[PDB]
Amino acid sequence: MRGSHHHHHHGMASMIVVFVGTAGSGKTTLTGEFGRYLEDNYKVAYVNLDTGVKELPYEPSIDVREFVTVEEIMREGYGPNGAIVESYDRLMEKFNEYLNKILRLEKENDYVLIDTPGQMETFLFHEFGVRLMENLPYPLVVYISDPEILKKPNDYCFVRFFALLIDLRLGATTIPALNKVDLLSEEEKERHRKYFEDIDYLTARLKLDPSMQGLMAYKMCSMMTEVLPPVRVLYLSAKTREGFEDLETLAYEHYCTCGD
Amino acid sequence: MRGSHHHHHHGMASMIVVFVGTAGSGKTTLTGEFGRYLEDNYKVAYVNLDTGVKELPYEPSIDVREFVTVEEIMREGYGPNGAIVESYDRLMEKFNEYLNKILRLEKENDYVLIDTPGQMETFLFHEFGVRLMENLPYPLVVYISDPEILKKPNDYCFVRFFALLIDLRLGATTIPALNKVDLLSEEEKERHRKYFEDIDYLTARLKLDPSMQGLMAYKMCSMMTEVLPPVRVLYLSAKTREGFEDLETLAYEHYCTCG
Numbered sequence: 001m002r003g004s005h006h007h008h009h010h011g012m013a014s015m016i017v018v019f020v021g022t023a024g025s026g027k028t029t030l031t032g033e034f035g036r037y038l039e040d041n042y043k044v045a046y047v048n049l050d051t052g053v054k055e056l057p058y059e060p061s062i063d064v065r066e067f068v069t070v071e072e073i074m075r076e077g078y079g080p081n082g083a084i085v086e087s088y089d090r091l092m093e094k095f096n097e098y099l100n101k102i103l104r105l106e107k108e109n110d111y112v113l114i115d116t117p118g119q120m121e122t123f124l125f126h127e128f129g130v131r132l133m134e135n136l137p138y139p140l141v142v143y144i145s146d147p148e149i150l151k152k153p154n155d156y157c158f159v160r161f162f163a164l165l166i167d168l169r170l171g172a173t174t175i176p177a178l179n180k181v182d183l184l185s186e187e188e189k190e191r192h193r194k195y196f197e198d199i200d201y202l203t204a205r206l207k208l209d210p211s212m213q214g215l216m217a218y219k220m221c222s223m224m225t226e227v228l229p230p231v232r233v234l235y236l237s238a239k240t241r242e243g244f245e246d247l248e249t250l251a252y253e254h255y256c257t258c259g260d
Numbered sequence: 261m262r263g264s265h266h267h268h269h270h271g272m273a274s275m276i277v278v279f280v281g282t283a284g285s286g287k288t289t290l291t292g293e294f295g296r297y298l299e300d301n302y303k304v305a306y307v308n309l310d311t312g313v314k315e316l317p318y319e320p321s322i323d324v325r326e327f328v329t330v331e332e333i334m335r336e337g338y339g340p341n342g343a344i345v346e347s348y349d350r351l352m353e354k355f356n357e358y359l360n361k362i363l364r365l366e367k368e369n370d371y372v373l374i375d376t377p378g379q380m381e382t383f384l385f386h387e388f389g390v391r392l393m394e395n396l397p398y399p400l401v402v403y404i405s406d407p408e409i410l411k412k413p414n415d416y417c418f419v420r421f422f423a424l425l426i427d428l429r430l431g432a433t434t435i436p437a438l439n440k441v442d443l444l445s446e447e448e449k450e451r452h453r454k455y456f457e458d459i460d461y462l463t464a465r466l467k468l469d470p471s472m473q474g475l476m477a478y479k480m481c482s483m484m485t486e487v488l489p490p491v492r493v494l495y496l497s498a499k500t501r502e503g504f505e506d507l508e509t510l511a512y513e514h515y516c517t518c519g
C-alpha cells in the first residue's frame with residue numbers, strides 16, 4: 001500500500017531512474033505518477049533537479065529549489081535563459097553535498113526517481129548534470145519524446161539518434177520512450193510503432209529516399225544499428241499510466257543485468 | 261563607420277547565417293559582433309528569434325519580442341520553462357507572418373544573421389524553428405559550443421555527431437565551431453585542435469577507454485571516419501573577433517557553391 005512504510009534492506013542496490021526530455025515533454029508529470037504507481041509496492045524517493053518549476057506533483061526528498069530558483073535569479077536582473085544557466089553555475093558550489101545526498105538515498109530506497117532540469121540541454125551541457133551522472137551507480141535514463149514531433153521517417157531517425165547521443169554524453173543506458181500516448185489514436189500509435197521501434201525496418205525505409213537528407217538519415221540510421229544492439233522502446237502516458245508495467249519490467253531487467 | 265548605408269543589388273541572393281548552440285554559448289554575442297564586423301563592407305540585417313533575452317547588442321530588423329516575451333507570459337502565471345515553450349506555441353500562430361518578413365529581408369540585404377532561441381532545444385524540437393529552416397534558401401548553420409564541455413575524448417565525438425544531427429534535423433549545412441576561445445590557454449587550444457583535426461588520433465584515444473561507454477564512442481568515431489568525412493571545426497571569439505575572417509570565407513564559399 002502507498003501508506004505502508006516499506007523497508008529497504010540498507011545497501012541492497014536500488015533502481016535509479018532518470019527522466020530526460022525536452023521542456024514540456026512530461027518529465028515532472030511522469031516522475032510523480034510513476035512514483036505513485038511504484039509506492040504501492042516499493043519504497044520510493046524523489047529528487048528534483050529543476051531550479052525553474054513552480055509546483056511539484058510529488059514530495060521531493062531532495063529539491064534544488066531550496067538553494068536557488070530561476071525566478072529568484074531573474075529578480076536580480078537576469079533574463080530567463082541567462083537565469084537558468086546561472087542557477088546551475090551557483091548550484092555547483094553544493095555539488096558534493098547534493099551528490100552525497102543522492103548517494104545516501106540510493107542506499108535507503110528501492111527506487112530513486114530523478115526529475116531533471118526542464119531544458120534537457122541544461123542537464124546535458126552543464127557540469128552539474130554531467131558530473132552527477134558520472135557519479136551515480138548504474139542509472140537508467142528514460143528519454144521521453146512528444147509524438148507530435150514524429151511526422152516523417154527522418155524524424156524517427158532524429159529522435160533515435162538523439163537517444164544514442166544522450167547515452168554517449170551521460171555514459172548511462174538510455175531507453176527511448178514516447179510520452180503522452182494517451183493523446184494518440186490507435187492508428188497513430190501503430191504508425192509510430194512501425195517506425196520508432198524497428199530500426200532495421202526504419203533503415204530500410206530511409207534507404208528508399210534518394211534525397212540528400214534521406215541519404216544522411218540512411219547513413220546515420222545504419223551506423224546506429226551497428227553501434228547499438230536492438231533496444232526496447234517504451235510508449236508511456238504519465239496521465240493514464242499506460243506503459244508503466246513495461247517501464248517497471250525494463251528497470252528490473254536493467255537491475256539484474258547490472259551487478260553480474 | 262556605423263553610419264555607412266551599403267547598397268544591396270536587388271536580384272542578388274543574400275547570405276543567411278544562422279547561429280545555434282546551447283543557452284549561454286554566445287549566439288547573441290556572436291550575432292552582434294560578427295554583424296558589426298560585416299557592416300564594414302556589407303548591408304546586414306539581424307533577426308532575433310529569442311523571446312527571452314532582455315537586451316540585444318544589435319538592432320534587430322525582425323524581433324519576435326515585439327509580439328511576446330517570456331517575461332510577459334510569466335506574468336500570466338507560467339514558470340520560466342513553461343513560459344519559454346508557451347512563447348513559441350504562441351509565435352507559431354504567426355509563423356507565416358515571420359517567415360514572410362524574413363524572406364523579404366533576404367531580398368534586400370547582403371547578409372541576414374539569425375540569432376535563434378536561447379535554448380537550442382526550442383529551435384530543434386519545436387515546430388517553429390524546423391519549419392522556418394525548411395523554408396529558407398540555403399541557410400548556413402553555425403553550431404557553436406563552449407570549450408568548457410570538452411573535458412574528455414568522447415566529448416569531441418559528441419560535438420561532431422551533434423552537429424551532424426543538427427544538419428539532419430534542419431536540412432542545412434552545419435559548421436561546428438567553438439566560441440569563447442579567447443578564454444583558452446595556448447595548450448588548451450592545441451589540445452582541442454588535435455582531437456578535432458586528427459581523427460585517427462581521436463579514435464585511437466577512444467580505444468584506450470575500457471569503460472562501457474568507451475567502446476561506444478570508439479565504435480562510432482570509427483564509423484564516422486568512414487561514411488561522413490569530418491568537417492573542419494571553427495574557432496571563434498565573439499569578444500575578440502578571432503575566427504571572423506575564417507567564418508566570412510566559409511560563408512562566401514558556401515554561397516558560391518549554392519548559387
Ligand SMILES: Nc1nc2c(ncn2[C@@H]2O[C@H](COP(=O)(O)OP(=O)(O)O)[C@@H](O)[C@H]2O)c(=O)[nH]1
Binds near residue numbers: 023182239
Ligand atoms: N495528455 C498528456 N499530457 C501530459 C502527459 N505528461 C505530461 N503532460 C502535460 O504536459 C505538460 C508538461 O508536463 P511537465 O511534466 O511539466 O513537462 P516537463 O517540462 O518535461 O517536466 C503539463 O501540462 C502536463 O500535464 C501525458 O502523458 N499526457
Ligand SMILES: Nc1nc2c(ncn2[C@@H]2O[C@H](COP(=O)(O)OP(=O)(O)O)[C@@H](O)[C@H]2O)c(=O)[nH]1
Binds near residue numbers: 286290442
Ligand atoms: N569570454 C567570452 N565570453 C563570451 C563570448 N561570447 C559570449 N560570451 C559571454 O557569454 C555569455 C552568454 O552569451 P550570449 O551571447 O548571451 O549566449 P546565448 O544564450 O547563446 O545567446 C554572455 O555573458 C557573453 O558576454 C566570447 O567569445 N568570449
Ligand SMILES: [Mg+2]
Binds near residue numbers: 027028053115117118
Ligand atoms: Mg519538469
Ligand SMILES: [Mg+2]
Binds near residue numbers: 081082
Ligand atoms: Mg535570457
Ligand SMILES: [Mg+2]
Binds near residue numbers: 288289310375377378
Ligand atoms: Mg541569446
